[PDB]
Amino acid sequence: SPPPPHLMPYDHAAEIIKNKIKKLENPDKRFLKYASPHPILASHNHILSAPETRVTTLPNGLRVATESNLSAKTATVGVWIDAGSRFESDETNGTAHFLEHMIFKGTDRRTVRALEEEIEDIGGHLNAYTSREQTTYYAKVLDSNVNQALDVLADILQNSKFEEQRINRERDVILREMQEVEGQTDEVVLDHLHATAFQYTPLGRTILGPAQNVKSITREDLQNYIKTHYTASRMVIAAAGAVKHEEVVEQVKKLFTKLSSDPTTTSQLVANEPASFTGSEVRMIDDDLPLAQFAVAFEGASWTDPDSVALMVMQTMLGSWNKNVGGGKHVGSDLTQRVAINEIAESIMAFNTNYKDTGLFGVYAVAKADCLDDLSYAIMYEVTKLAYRVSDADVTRARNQLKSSLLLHMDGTSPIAEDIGRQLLTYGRRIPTAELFARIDAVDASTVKRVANKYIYDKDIAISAIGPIQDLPDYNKFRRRTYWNRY
């Protein structure tokens, strides 16, 4: 007689696994009532209500924009300026970053210690960030100290001292910062991508600038920079949280009196020094780094181009992923599926960067040396596929994800104030959520195919790579993988 099906150890294990499988064979319908794996385009313009964003223009062209939440206990107030490294010159390059270092270094009324003691006595925070086309200084304070923060910002923008010893100390701080450009390889890769893609244009310069420029920086340089660029028509004062529009407007009218009023205007600056894309690559071969990092990019779209929304949808379609994400093998993005299913990268990330007259659309990846060939094939395949085959489900899911991320990231006074300032600088207005959603849902599969055929198909690419990249395919192979010869 044969043994019964629990005597032998392997038969018993087979019985256990079979019983578990039968348990999975019969689902419970109470837990299968609402969620669906099929994406549906939904219209919910009722929940989309938000507090009004008041925009007031002063007689000198200064704009004050507030988003009031008087139930909040805090607020974010700041200045967003249409200024950055792109609007400098070759010999002035780096001045904006130096000013960012020097702006909290004391004024006629306040010394460095007074300024820090005033701020951190109320528990506030002071932030300064400069980019290629945008500069912002803002304060996160309690609702009571809105007027004090506005006074602090107006003072530092209008009455900075720029002591020569302070300038010399910051000169060496920044020189050491330039000498220590390592450990942040993402930022390095993107800098080299900008440098080679926007060759011989103001957009190709780094924010930091060359070492000789920072060595040559003096007081009159910084004062001339502020006089040239920090003008009323180029500045937006944005407040979010527990703030009333009228009080902020009155305080701004009181404090921001001695501005520059230089006639220099950003549209003319972009017009006479335009940014163009040059198909090109920089390969920084270093076989001691454990991981390779590269970015591939196409020429993208400007802020105001209608195709920018479609490019955002396409970026969502490509997606982003790293090895610590649980479900990369199951996501809607085919590129993420390929990468996660075959373990061919440490991280992947699609980016859509916009500027006033151009943009960058591409993919940034981190991977081991031996994965590079397959990873490059997969990236190029899935990017080029956007010009040929787009399913309605994928574009619907991407639209839903994009709307969700845009609304979900907008939490807190600081992100709201940043959104207000950025939109006022790039669009001239804060685009209401309903209009943005309507523009997003106008991006269908045919729209994605049209935009991809305009921007991706048979197009020059810019590459920036660093690390053990000897097996990264050369420029001709990436250029060939931008079209499909079976169509």
Partner: peptide
């Protein structure tokens, strides 16, 4: 002194020849 490759990696150049 700093070798040329390190300087190139540390200083992106938009005036590439």
């Amino acid at each position: 002194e700093v070798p040329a490759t390190v300087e190139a990696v540390k200083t992106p150049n938009s005036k590439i020849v």
